[PDB]
């Protein structure tokens, strides 16, 4: 059984909680960066260690490595997301990916070109997300955000708040194709099917998309348990 390796923001280096729910029969291992805040200043303090964490996961027998942070991978633009991926691959000899690549792949899989943004972030990070998506030939539309920079604070946001955030972002641009719910620090699994039910458009969420994309890269065609959104169930 291929192990999937994940580089995660918190120092503790825990497998993000969504994995046990989405893919209960797949093994995940993780290595933690110790990110201090979800801000460019925070990213700058850990970004250089990503390659070393990739190498650790390789030594542990990982079959694929994903950098499981959207903003760490998009904050410098599309070229850096690609270059960082290549650096990880050259360091490990393994298939490597990032949570930003994951959400691009998920949005494309669901036919989303015009995308409403529902995010956890402050606006410098939101602007960088919009610029990244535009570089990648997507069209960011409405935007609502929570303005959070703490890693732990993001895990505390409840399902109903996240459903409402998505609905408000979509209602700001109701001819959008879908919604990006951005930040792998959010616990979004119960929010996704509710938003999709109510609005009739797909949602791509950072953490779940990261898992979907890593499992994709592992090349076994493993399928998630049902009810976590069209991204998973449309296979
Ligand atoms: O995805 C992000 O942009 C940030 C993030 C990822 C995982 C845990 C906390 C924050």
CSV table of C-alpha atoms and ligand atoms in Angstrom, one decimal:
chain,number,residue,atom,x,y,z
A,1,UNK,CA,0.0,0.0,0.0
A,2,UNK,CA,1.5,3.4,-1.1
A,3,UNK,CA,2.0,5.8,1.7
A,4,UNK,CA,1.0,9.4,1.0
A,5,UNK,CA,3.2,12.1,2.5
A,6,UNK,CA,2.0,15.5,3.5
A,7,UNK,CA,3.9,18.7,4.5
A,8,UNK,CA,1.6,20.6,6.9
A,9,UNK,CA,1.8,24.1,8.5
A,10,UNK,CA,1.5,23.2,12.2
A,11,UNK,CA,4.7,22.3,14.1
A,12,UNK,CA,3.1,19.1,15.4
A,13,UNK,CA,3.1,17.7,11.9
A,14,UNK,CA,-0.3,16.0,12.2
A,15,UNK,CA,-2.2,14.4,9.3
A,16,UNK,CA,-5.0,16.8,8.6
A,17,UNK,CA,-8.2,15.4,10.1
A,18,UNK,CA,-10.1,15.1,6.8
A,19,UNK,CA,-8.0,12.1,5.7
A,20,UNK,CA,-9.5,9.7,8.2
A,21,UNK,CA,-13.0,10.6,7.0
A,22,UNK,CA,-12.4,10.8,3.2
A,23,UNK,CA,-10.0,7.9,2.8
A,24,UNK,CA,-10.2,5.8,6.0
A,25,UNK,CA,-8.3,2.9,4.5
A,26,UNK,CA,-5.4,4.9,3.1
A,27,UNK,CA,-2.2,5.6,5.0
A,28,UNK,CA,-1.0,9.2,5.4
A,29,UNK,CA,2.1,10.5,7.0
A,30,UNK,CA,3.0,14.1,7.7
A,31,UNK,CA,5.8,16.4,8.6
A,32,UNK,CA,5.2,19.8,10.2
A,33,UNK,CA,6.7,23.2,9.2
A,34,UNK,CA,5.9,25.2,12.3
A,35,UNK,CA,4.2,28.1,10.5
A,36,UNK,CA,3.6,31.0,12.8
A,37,UNK,CA,0.8,32.9,11.0
A,38,UNK,CA,-1.1,32.6,7.8
A,39,UNK,CA,0.6,35.7,6.3
A,40,UNK,CA,3.4,36.3,3.8
A,41,UNK,CA,5.7,37.2,6.8
A,42,UNK,CA,4.8,33.8,8.2
A,43,UNK,CA,5.4,32.0,4.9
A,44,UNK,CA,8.8,33.5,4.4
A,45,UNK,CA,9.9,32.0,7.8
A,46,UNK,CA,9.2,28.4,6.8
A,47,UNK,CA,9.0,28.3,2.9
A,48,UNK,CA,12.7,27.4,2.6
A,49,UNK,CA,12.3,24.2,4.7
A,50,UNK,CA,9.7,22.7,2.4
A,51,UNK,CA,12.3,20.7,0.3
A,52,UNK,CA,13.8,19.2,3.5
A,53,UNK,CA,10.4,18.1,4.7
A,54,UNK,CA,9.8,16.5,1.3
A,55,UNK,CA,13.1,14.6,1.6
A,56,UNK,CA,12.1,13.4,5.1
A,57,UNK,CA,8.9,12.0,3.8
A,58,UNK,CA,10.7,10.3,0.9
A,59,UNK,CA,13.1,8.6,3.4
A,60,UNK,CA,10.0,7.4,5.3
A,61,UNK,CA,8.8,5.6,2.2
A,62,UNK,CA,6.2,8.1,0.9
A,63,UNK,CA,5.0,7.3,-2.6
A,64,UNK,CA,3.9,10.9,-3.2
A,65,UNK,CA,4.5,14.2,-1.4
A,66,UNK,CA,2.0,17.1,-1.2
A,67,UNK,CA,2.6,20.5,0.3
A,68,UNK,CA,-0.7,20.8,2.2
A,69,UNK,CA,-1.0,24.6,2.3
A,70,UNK,CA,-2.8,26.7,-0.3
A,71,UNK,CA,-1.4,30.1,0.6
A,72,UNK,CA,2.2,28.9,1.2
A,73,UNK,CA,2.0,27.6,-2.4
A,74,UNK,CA,0.2,30.5,-4.1
A,75,UNK,CA,1.5,33.6,-2.3
A,76,UNK,CA,4.3,34.3,-4.8
A,77,UNK,CA,2.2,33.5,-7.9
A,78,UNK,CA,1.8,30.6,-10.3
A,79,UNK,CA,5.4,30.3,-11.5
A,80,UNK,CA,6.6,29.8,-7.9
A,81,UNK,CA,4.0,27.1,-7.3
A,82,UNK,CA,5.4,25.3,-10.3
A,83,UNK,CA,9.0,25.9,-9.4
A,84,UNK,CA,8.6,24.7,-5.8
A,85,UNK,CA,6.9,21.5,-7.1
A,86,UNK,CA,9.8,20.8,-9.4
A,87,UNK,CA,12.3,21.5,-6.5
A,88,UNK,CA,10.5,19.0,-4.3
A,89,UNK,CA,10.5,16.4,-7.1
A,90,UNK,CA,14.2,16.9,-7.8
A,91,UNK,CA,14.9,16.5,-4.1
A,92,UNK,CA,12.9,13.2,-3.7
A,93,UNK,CA,12.5,11.5,-7.1
A,94,UNK,CA,8.8,11.3,-6.2
A,95,UNK,CA,5.5,12.6,-7.6
A,96,UNK,CA,5.0,15.9,-5.8
A,97,UNK,CA,2.1,18.4,-5.6
A,98,UNK,CA,0.8,21.3,-3.7
A,99,UNK,CA,-2.6,22.3,-2.3
A,100,UNK,CA,-2.7,25.2,-4.8
A,101,UNK,CA,-2.3,22.7,-7.7
A,102,UNK,CA,-4.9,20.6,-6.0
A,103,UNK,CA,-7.5,23.3,-6.0
A,104,UNK,CA,-6.7,24.2,-9.6
A,105,UNK,CA,-7.1,20.6,-10.6
A,106,UNK,CA,-10.4,20.3,-8.6
A,107,UNK,CA,-11.9,23.5,-10.2
A,108,UNK,CA,-11.0,22.3,-13.7
A,109,UNK,CA,-12.4,18.8,-12.9
A,110,UNK,CA,-15.7,20.4,-12.0
A,111,UNK,CA,-15.8,22.8,-15.0
A,112,UNK,CA,-15.4,25.9,-12.9
A,113,UNK,CA,-14.0,28.9,-14.8
A,114,UNK,CA,-15.8,31.8,-12.9
A,115,UNK,CA,-15.1,31.1,-9.3
A,116,UNK,CA,-16.5,32.8,-6.2
A,117,UNK,CA,-14.0,32.9,-3.3
A,118,UNK,CA,-14.9,32.1,0.3
A,119,UNK,CA,-11.7,32.2,2.4
A,120,UNK,CA,-10.3,32.2,5.9
A,121,UNK,CA,-7.7,34.9,5.0
A,122,UNK,CA,-6.8,38.6,5.4
A,123,UNK,CA,-6.9,40.6,2.2
A,124,UNK,CA,-3.2,40.6,1.2
A,125,UNK,CA,-3.6,36.9,1.0
A,126,UNK,CA,-7.0,37.1,-0.8
A,127,UNK,CA,-5.5,39.4,-3.4
A,128,UNK,CA,-2.6,37.0,-4.0
A,129,UNK,CA,-5.2,34.1,-4.4
A,130,UNK,CA,-7.1,36.1,-7.0
A,131,UNK,CA,-3.9,37.0,-8.9
A,132,UNK,CA,-2.8,33.3,-8.8
A,133,UNK,CA,-6.2,32.1,-10.1
A,134,UNK,CA,-6.1,34.8,-12.9
A,135,UNK,CA,-2.6,33.7,-13.9
A,136,UNK,CA,-4.0,30.2,-14.3
A,137,UNK,CA,-6.9,31.3,-16.6
A,138,UNK,CA,-9.6,31.3,-14.0
A,139,UNK,CA,-11.9,34.3,-13.2
A,140,UNK,CA,-12.3,35.1,-9.5
A,141,UNK,CA,-15.7,36.8,-9.0
A,142,UNK,CA,-17.3,37.5,-5.6
A,143,UNK,CA,-15.1,37.3,-2.4
A,144,UNK,CA,-16.0,37.0,1.3
A,145,UNK,CA,-13.4,36.2,3.9
A,146,UNK,CA,-12.9,35.6,7.6
A,147,UNK,CA,-9.7,37.6,8.1
A,148,UNK,CA,-8.0,35.0,10.2
A,149,UNK,CA,-4.2,34.6,10.5
A,150,UNK,CA,-4.0,32.0,13.4
A,151,UNK,CA,-3.6,28.3,12.4
A,152,UNK,CA,-5.6,27.1,15.5
A,153,UNK,CA,-8.2,29.8,15.0
A,154,UNK,CA,-9.1,28.4,11.6
A,155,UNK,CA,-9.9,25.0,13.0
A,156,UNK,CA,-12.4,26.6,15.4
A,157,UNK,CA,-14.7,27.9,12.7
A,158,UNK,CA,-17.9,26.0,12.7
A,159,UNK,CA,-19.8,24.3,9.8
A,160,UNK,CA,-22.7,26.8,9.7
A,161,UNK,CA,-20.4,29.8,9.5
A,162,UNK,CA,-18.6,28.2,6.6
A,163,UNK,CA,-21.9,27.4,4.8
A,164,UNK,CA,-22.9,31.0,5.2
A,165,UNK,CA,-19.6,32.3,4.0
A,166,UNK,CA,-19.9,30.3,0.8
A,167,UNK,CA,-23.5,31.4,0.2
A,168,UNK,CA,-22.7,35.1,0.8
A,169,UNK,CA,-19.7,34.9,-1.6
A,170,UNK,CA,-21.8,33.2,-4.2
A,171,UNK,CA,-24.7,35.7,-3.8
A,172,UNK,CA,-22.2,38.5,-4.5
A,173,UNK,CA,-21.7,36.9,-8.0
A,174,UNK,CA,-24.6,34.5,-8.6
A,175,UNK,CA,-23.7,33.7,-12.2
A,176,UNK,CA,-20.4,32.1,-11.0
A,177,UNK,CA,-19.7,28.4,-12.0
A,178,UNK,CA,-18.6,27.4,-8.5
A,179,UNK,CA,-17.0,28.3,-5.2
A,180,UNK,CA,-13.5,28.0,-3.9
A,181,UNK,CA,-13.5,27.6,-0.1
A,182,UNK,CA,-9.8,28.4,0.6
A,183,UNK,CA,-7.6,27.4,3.6
A,184,UNK,CA,-6.5,23.9,4.6
A,185,UNK,CA,-7.0,25.0,8.2
A,186,UNK,CA,-10.7,24.9,8.0
A,187,UNK,CA,-12.9,21.9,8.8
A,188,UNK,CA,-15.2,22.0,5.8
A,189,UNK,CA,-16.4,18.4,5.2
A,190,UNK,CA,-19.9,18.9,6.5
A,191,UNK,CA,-20.2,22.4,4.9
A,192,UNK,CA,-19.5,21.2,1.3
A,193,UNK,CA,-22.5,19.0,0.6
A,194,UNK,CA,-24.8,21.6,2.2
A,195,UNK,CA,-23.5,24.4,0.1
A,196,UNK,CA,-23.8,22.2,-3.1
A,197,UNK,CA,-27.3,21.2,-2.1
A,198,UNK,CA,-28.5,24.7,-1.5
A,199,UNK,CA,-26.8,26.5,-4.5
A,200,UNK,CA,-26.6,23.8,-7.2
A,201,UNK,CA,-22.9,24.7,-7.9
A,202,UNK,CA,-19.8,22.7,-7.0
A,203,UNK,CA,-17.5,23.7,-4.1
A,204,UNK,CA,-13.7,23.0,-4.1
A,205,UNK,CA,-12.3,23.2,-0.6
A,206,UNK,CA,-8.6,23.4,0.2
A,207,UNK,CA,-8.1,20.4,2.6
A,208,UNK,CA,-10.4,17.9,0.9
A,209,UNK,CA,-9.0,18.9,-2.6
A,210,UNK,CA,-5.5,18.4,-1.2
A,211,UNK,CA,-6.4,14.8,-0.3
A,212,UNK,CA,-8.2,14.2,-3.6
A,213,UNK,CA,-5.2,15.5,-5.5
A,214,UNK,CA,-2.6,13.5,-3.5
A,215,UNK,CA,-4.6,10.3,-4.0
A,216,UNK,CA,-4.9,11.2,-7.7
A,217,UNK,CA,-1.1,11.4,-7.9
A,218,UNK,CA,-0.7,8.1,-6.1
A,219,UNK,CA,-2.3,6.6,-9.2
A,220,UNK,CA,-4.3,3.8,-7.6
A,221,UNK,CA,-7.7,5.4,-8.4
A,222,UNK,CA,-8.8,5.1,-4.8
A,223,UNK,CA,-12.3,6.6,-4.2
A,224,UNK,CA,-13.4,8.6,-1.1
A,225,UNK,CA,-16.3,7.7,1.1
A,226,UNK,CA,-19.5,9.3,-0.3
A,227,UNK,CA,-21.1,12.6,0.7
A,228,UNK,CA,-18.2,15.0,0.7
A,229,UNK,CA,-19.0,16.8,-2.5
A,230,UNK,CA,-19.1,16.5,-6.3
A,231,UNK,CA,-15.3,16.6,-6.5
A,232,UNK,CA,-15.2,13.1,-4.9
A,233,UNK,CA,-18.5,11.7,-5.9
A,234,UNK,CA,-18.2,12.4,-9.7
A,235,UNK,CA,-16.1,9.3,-10.3
B,1,LIG,O1,-4.3,26.5,3.2
B,1,LIG,C1,-3.8,27.6,3.7
B,1,LIG,O2,-3.7,28.6,2.9
B,1,LIG,C2,-3.4,27.8,5.1
B,1,LIG,C3,-3.4,26.6,6.1
B,1,LIG,C4,-3.3,25.2,5.7
B,1,LIG,C5,-3.3,24.3,6.7
B,1,LIG,C6,-3.5,24.6,8.0
B,1,LIG,C7,-3.6,25.9,8.4
B,1,LIG,C8,-3.6,26.9,7.4
